[PDB]
Every structure is written in structure tokens, then in C-alpha cells.
Design an enzyme around this catalytic site. Sequence first.
Site, PDB file in Angstrom:
ATOM      1  N   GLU A  35       8.592  -5.768   6.952  1.00  0.00           N
ATOM      2  CA  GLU A  35       7.077  -6.353   5.742  1.00  0.00           C
ATOM      3  C   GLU A  35       7.393  -7.741   6.262  1.00  0.00           C
ATOM      4  O   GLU A  35       6.641  -8.652   6.223  1.00  0.00           O
ATOM      5  CB  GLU A  35       7.797  -5.803   4.748  1.00  0.00           C
ATOM      6  CG  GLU A  35       7.688  -3.405   3.724  1.00  0.00           C
ATOM      7  CD  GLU A  35       6.366  -3.921   4.177  1.00  0.00           C
ATOM      8  OE1 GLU A  35       5.383  -3.143   3.932  1.00  0.00           O
ATOM      9  OE2 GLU A  35       5.218  -4.897   3.127  1.00  0.00           O
ATOM     10  N   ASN A  46      -4.202  -9.507   0.317  1.00  0.00           N
ATOM     11  CA  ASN A  46      -4.902  -8.722   1.378  1.00  0.00           C
ATOM     12  C   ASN A  46      -6.247  -8.965   0.625  1.00  0.00           C
ATOM     13  O   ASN A  46      -6.935 -10.297  -0.032  1.00  0.00           O
ATOM     14  CB  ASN A  46      -4.498  -7.645  -0.225  1.00  0.00           C
ATOM     15  CG  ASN A  46      -3.030  -7.440   0.876  1.00  0.00           C
ATOM     16  OD1 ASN A  46      -2.477  -7.012   1.045  1.00  0.00           O
ATOM     17  ND2 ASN A  46      -2.212  -7.369  -0.741  1.00  0.00           N
ATOM     18  N   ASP A  48      -8.382  -7.393  -0.855  1.00  0.00           N
ATOM     19  CA  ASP A  48      -8.829  -7.485  -2.341  1.00  0.00           C
ATOM     20  C   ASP A  48      -8.557  -8.342  -3.152  1.00  0.00           C
ATOM     21  O   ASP A  48      -8.501  -8.635  -4.535  1.00  0.00           O
ATOM     22  CB  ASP A  48      -8.336  -5.919  -3.112  1.00  0.00           C
ATOM     23  CG  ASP A  48      -6.612  -5.876  -3.236  1.00  0.00           C
ATOM     24  OD1 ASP A  48      -5.936  -7.219  -3.179  1.00  0.00           O
ATOM     25  OD2 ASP A  48      -5.833  -5.642  -3.615  1.00  0.00           O
ATOM     26  N   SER A  50      -5.232  -9.986  -3.772  1.00  0.00           N
ATOM     27  CA  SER A  50      -4.251  -9.863  -3.950  1.00  0.00           C
ATOM     28  C   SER A  50      -3.252 -10.401  -3.164  1.00  0.00           C
ATOM     29  O   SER A  50      -3.930 -10.707  -2.025  1.00  0.00           O
ATOM     30  CB  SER A  50      -4.027  -7.976  -4.581  1.00  0.00           C
ATOM     31  OG  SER A  50      -3.370  -7.889  -3.850  1.00  0.00           O
ATOM     32  N   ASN A  59       3.417  -6.896  -4.126  1.00  0.00           N
ATOM     33  CA  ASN A  59       1.394  -7.028  -4.099  1.00  0.00           C
ATOM     34  C   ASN A  59       1.664  -7.386  -5.990  1.00  0.00           C
ATOM     35  O   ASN A  59       2.611  -6.436  -6.362  1.00  0.00           O
ATOM     36  CB  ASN A  59       0.662  -5.711  -3.871  1.00  0.00           C
ATOM     37  CG  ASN A  59      -0.212  -5.924  -3.803  1.00  0.00           C
ATOM     38  OD1 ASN A  59      -0.852  -6.183  -5.255  1.00  0.00           O
ATOM     39  ND2 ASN A  59      -0.953  -6.797  -3.172  1.00  0.00           N
ATOM     40  N   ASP A 101       8.643   4.810  -8.776  1.00  0.00           N
ATOM     41  CA  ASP A 101       7.498   4.880  -9.711  1.00  0.00           C
ATOM     42  C   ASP A 101       6.429   6.043  -9.621  1.00  0.00           C
ATOM     43  O   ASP A 101       6.124   6.580 -10.028  1.00  0.00           O
ATOM     44  CB  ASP A 101       6.890   3.708  -8.896  1.00  0.00           C
ATOM     45  CG  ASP A 101       5.053   3.689  -9.852  1.00  0.00           C
ATOM     46  OD1 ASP A 101       5.244   2.969 -11.526  1.00  0.00           O
ATOM     47  OD2 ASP A 101       4.098   3.923  -8.798  1.00  0.00           O
TER      48      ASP A 101
END
Length: 129
Positions: A35, A46, A48, A50, A59, A101
Site C-alpha cells: 500500500e 483517487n 472519486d 477521495s 481512505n 467492518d
Amino acid sequence: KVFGRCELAAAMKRHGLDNYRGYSLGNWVCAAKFESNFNTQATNRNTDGSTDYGILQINSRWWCNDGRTPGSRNLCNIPCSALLSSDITASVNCAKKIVSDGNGMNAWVAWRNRCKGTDVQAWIRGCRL
Ligand SMILES: [Cl-]
Ligand code: NA
């Protein structure tokens, strides 16, 4: 801070990630390698709008507030900049919420594509833990 492999393994172990939700330490070291290349200051934007922050590239759409991701949640209740510290505590505490999650470590695309199903114990071989 750019961590060494065994240095990070030991910090993650101390912060309770070894076998957290069933994921052995090697999984977390492998994810951090791909990562962020073990660099706490890594950021990536990103499509989008973010941004991903820190050693585990968390994120801003869901997990932290960076003041520029409209309609984002801040589920770890932290500014995203706190994830770039040389102290990995905030990153670890937020990662624990992510991995609980529902889809586990598949939330980290690099883990799913580059660590999952590999011999991840290799990432902690040789370390004094
Ligand atoms: Cl799981
Ligand atoms: Na957010």
C-alpha cells in the site's frame, strides 16, 4: 518515517494487530508494503476525489476527515493528517475498525491482489518478535 520490515512488524505486534480478527501479522506487513512501501507519509488521490493516507492507505471517503472529500464520513473520528505520523497508533486503531467492518482485509485492494493466498509468513521471517 520509512519503516524497516521487522521494525514495522514489531510495532504492529505491540499495537495488537497479530491475529487481529484472525489475520496473522504477516498479512498486515504485506499490506503495508504494497500500500505505502512502509512510508507513513504516503498519500494517493483517487478518481472519486477521495485520498488515501498513510502506511495503510486509509481512505477519506469513509474513515477520516481531510476537509476536501464532500459527503464523506469520518468513521475513525480523526483528521486524515493524523494517519501520516511516524507513530502508527492512529493508523492501527482505524485499521482495526475497517477490518471489523464486514469484508475483512479485502478492503485493502493491494492485500487482496498481492498478499491474499500467498505465503505471508515470509514477511516476518528473520525478525525478533
Ligand atoms: Cl475475515
Ligand atoms: Na471523510
